[PDB]
Amino acid sequence: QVEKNKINNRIADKAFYQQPDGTEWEKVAQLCDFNPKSSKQCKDVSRLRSVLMSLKQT
Amino acid sequence: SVNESLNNLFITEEDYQALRTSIDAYDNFDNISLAQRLEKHELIEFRRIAAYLFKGNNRWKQSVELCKKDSLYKDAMQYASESKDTELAEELLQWFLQEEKRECFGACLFTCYDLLRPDVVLETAWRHNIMDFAMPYFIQVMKEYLTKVDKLDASESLRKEEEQA
Amino acid sequence: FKGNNRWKQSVELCKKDSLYKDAMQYASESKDTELAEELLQWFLQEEKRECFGACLFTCYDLLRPDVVLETAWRHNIMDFAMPYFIQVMKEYLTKVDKLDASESLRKEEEQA
Amino acid sequence: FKGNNRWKQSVELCKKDSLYKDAMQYASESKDTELAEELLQWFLQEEKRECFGACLFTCYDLLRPDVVLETAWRHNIMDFAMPYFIQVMKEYLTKVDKLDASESLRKEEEQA
Description:
The structure is cut from a larger assembly and holds 1 copy of chain A and 3 copies of chain B.
Chain A: H1 2-16, H2 23-31
Chain B: H1 2-12, H2 17-25, H3 32-39, H4 44-56, H5 63-70, H6 75-82, H7 89-98, H8 102-111, H9 118-128, H10 135-163
Helix pairs in contact in B: 1-2, 3-4, 4-5, 5-6, 6-8, 7-8
PDB class: endocytosis
Keywords: clathrin, clathrin adaptor, ap2, clathrin assembly, endocytosis
Entry title: Clathrin with bound beta2 appendage of AP2
């Protein structure tokens, strides 16, 4: 119960512990990952594609 | 109601999920007390929802800070992104330069690429000796600048051909 | 072939043939779009970048420096590429100043 | 000399002997273009460039950063230029910003 959800959050945090504080670039990509949301009116960059070839999958 | 009592139970029962669904289901309560219960309930998700409803109660500058209390692995910045308000990335990104966790800093500069000036960018680049995810900043800057100069050309060309009449 | 208006294969083949650059010369004089990108990219697949100056030079007229910088930094190539960027800033800065002049004239004339 | 309205000899004398920021002291008053380029380059020949950011700013009014980037490349030199580079882009930043503004104004007023 309490311990159940607690250790679930703790292992989710262990996944969230898998970082400092290629591997780094795929890690930031998984970290910095956009999605087809409806709020992109602010800047509308295209480099969202770049990570796919700039540093990740590179 | 039985609903609000059950929400208080889930607060005691250390349940946020059903508590979240329920606090979405009704408003017949305040969230300041909800904030106090969540932000100190030992779960990163409880404090997450407390910070969430902070700005929901028009109470900013602490929600992001509350996630910075518990959700350190960019999960603070994860919602600092959606916090929708400026005047955050400057100081927060400077602090995040202080502890060199640049692994998340790419996302930080990403979320608010819109409201940036290159001045501080070269400042922190030449300072922290950081070109990764800054050269791409160069690229996007020039790209949007290509767009600028070109649409400017379009506009001025139209204006001149008009005034030829 | 270019007389037959069938480009981009003849010169493409003389890539494999004109080891004396003559493809690059002729890919340059091809005067055609959206290809010199991948052409020079292939040219990067090998290291004849000794003469990449001309490769960027001839077709500079109609490029997009975005992917230029992307790849150059990707390939870490500012060396023997700097002059290109210096010229790039000559060009864009001339653009901005002349348009400044023009718009300023619009502002002064719009008094009515 | 400027008391006699003949420059380029006075600051040239500062170049002779009074180099200890006094060369710059009259580079300031020199206040005229098409000299500071070559004078400042010669100044770079010797490694008093240490403060060349100031040495260029003391007459910054009419400098075009393109030659600056060129000579920065020529020695592969970035110090007291990286700052001037920030200058370049931030003035250019402000410039493109006011340009976007003015353009918005123009296109909106075109309707009427």
